[PDB]
Amino acid sequence: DVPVNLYRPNAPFIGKVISNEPLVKEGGIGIVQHIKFDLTGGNLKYIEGQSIGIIPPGVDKNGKPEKLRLYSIASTRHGDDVDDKTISLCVRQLEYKHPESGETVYGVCSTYLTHIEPGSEVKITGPVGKEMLLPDDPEANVIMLAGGTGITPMRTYLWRMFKDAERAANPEYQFKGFSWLVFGVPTTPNILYKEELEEIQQKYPDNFRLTYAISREQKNPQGGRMYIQDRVAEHADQLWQLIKNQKTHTYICGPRGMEEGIDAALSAAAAKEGVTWSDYQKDLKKAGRWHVETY
């Protein structure tokens, strides 16, 4: 039922880039791009929460052909234009420091993708992943804990749930539960998809809450920079009360090691009612209701 591995690295899909638009507005840190690809000519179907591979051209430092890098899909099953013809990605350009051979090193596939022109041919594999799937239940609660490009599967959920054209195209999924996004980025220019996320909250104030953790603009109560863990600590009691519902699913996506502060915050909340969180979390993972994808 769930589409998986319709294309594989030995015979990938050759898709064309349609658009490559900036998501980091002026004044932000780094480059993150929304890249849309053409899927006509082949049979690549996908659903929300899945990933695709991109194989970059040329060779590595050892002369061997470059491997795929996995990217979370930014679009719903229908694509951004709700036509069943496209797929989108949300790609950060990886750039880093001076003690790693050279002066500034740029990541291979992400610099390729972030500078790619419309009309160019791309090797696409997949879709992969059954870890970040949205339930078919319209009455489910969805907590979304996103850091940076961790917004990317959250975009696919929130678009399916709340965009007018998506609701018209999906008669079996008219969402009426509650969704909460806690989004951690460094600046207000770095709030990826800000205007559309804020449009959804103004249109659906009882069904979507939007919380920001903006590190260069806000401080936590200890005087340090505001991160996603601090906003989870601020709302730990509320989030635990929602997690107790049998129909609540929680999604964690973003940088590796973000799980640690979220676990500590929900541990203090769960302990007030005599529950050890690390054990309750194991049962949620078993039930398929605690979904993690960090990198």
Ligand SMILES: Cc1cc2nc3c(=O)[nH]c(=O)nc-3n(C[C@H](O)[C@H](O)[C@H](O)COP(=O)(O)OP(=O)(O)OC[C@H]3O[C@@H](n4cnc5c(N)ncnc54)[C@H](O)[C@@H]3O)c2cc1C
């Ligand atoms: C399931 C999954 C989903 C993902 N989704 C997305 C997504 O939606 N958007 C997105 O932008 N990315 C996503 N990523 C990460 C993405 O796959 C690639 O890892 C990333 O884009 C960098 O690939 P590259 O080819 O640009 O870098 P490479 O050229 O392979 O460079 C990466 C390598 O350089 C080193 N390196 C990286 N950062 C540093 C640092 N700060 N200091 C020192 N060394 C470092 C490491 O050796 C690392 O293996 C996802 C990863 C996974 C596993």
